[PDB]
């Protein structure tokens, strides 16, 4: 996976091809986070193939639908248990994020795992994501926003629009 743009939470459900020797194979549901469904199906045949004795050729996908956010208007703390392969070995990690959508936090995780650890999308395996209350958060960067009557200014606001006036007589101000 390339993790292009904002990822989408797909509920890919699949099973093996029914055979006369073992008919009615069980249905397996996964929680895939791919930018589109074509990648969500390929990602499904990556974890199911290594967890079970199932292959894309000997199996079928019965449902691959996008999971919408049930509470898009509420800020939620997410906890993402994931394993990633460094240049040396594989390590388990647990990250925390504040966002509105589960897929917007997993997308925010790929941007962070690649920033702080140079981990590419093909090396990260998102194992578990669940909304966590503010009383069970561990990271101080996430837990510092768990404060009512929060207040902070915007110190030293960088002047954007640097080229709309390219040559001006007035030097810009950074205090507003």
């Amino acid at each position: 996976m390339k993790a292009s743009g904002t990822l989408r939470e797909y509920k890919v459900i699949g099973r093996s091809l029914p055979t006369p020797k073992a008919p009615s194979p069980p249905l397996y549901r996964m929680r895939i986070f791919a930018p589109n469904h074509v990648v969500a199906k390929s990602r499904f045949w990556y974890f199911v193939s290594q967890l079970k004795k199932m292959k894309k050729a000997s199996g079928e996908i019965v449902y691959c639908g996008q999971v919408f956010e049930k509470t898009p208007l509420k800020v939620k703390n997410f906890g993402i248990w994931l394993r990633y392969d460094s240049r040396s070995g594989t390590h388990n990690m647990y990250r925390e994020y504040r966002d509105l959508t589960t897929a917007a936090a997993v997308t925010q995780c790929y941007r962070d795992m690649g920033a702080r650890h140079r981990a590419r999308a093909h090396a990260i395996q998102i194992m578990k994501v669940e909304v966590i209350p503010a009383s069970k958060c561990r990271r101080p960067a996430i837990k510092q926003f768990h404060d009512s009557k929060i207040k902070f200014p915007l110190p030293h606001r960088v002047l954007r629009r640097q080229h709309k006036p390219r040559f001006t007589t007035k030097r810009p101000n950074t205090f507003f």
Partner: protein, 134 residues
Amino acid sequence: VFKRYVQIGRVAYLSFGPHAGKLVAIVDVIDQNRALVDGPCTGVRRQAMPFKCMQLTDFVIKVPHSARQKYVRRAWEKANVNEKWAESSWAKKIDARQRKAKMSDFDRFKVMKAKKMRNKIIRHEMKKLQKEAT
């Protein structure tokens, strides 16, 4: 030294973006970069929005934490944000800047003629006081 802060209920002006020029109320702070603003009386529904497109105003409404749009609208109307903003110099300079951009060629000619005589009358008054003071 700071007077305008980012807090729950801080009315902000959107400089650019899809809702550029509208006022929103900061109902929640998601992270250091984004916030959860909601303008019920302006036309900006509840959504995430970065701080780089916001400009803090001198208006703070009393809204609870993560209250729905019904109560964010009351504080917006209780504090008379739209009335105080429309009479503030911030919006009046925006209104003046919008009217100057919609001036036709005949409007500029009326401004050219008005400013030509207005300056010559003021410029002579400055010469009148200089002669009087000496």
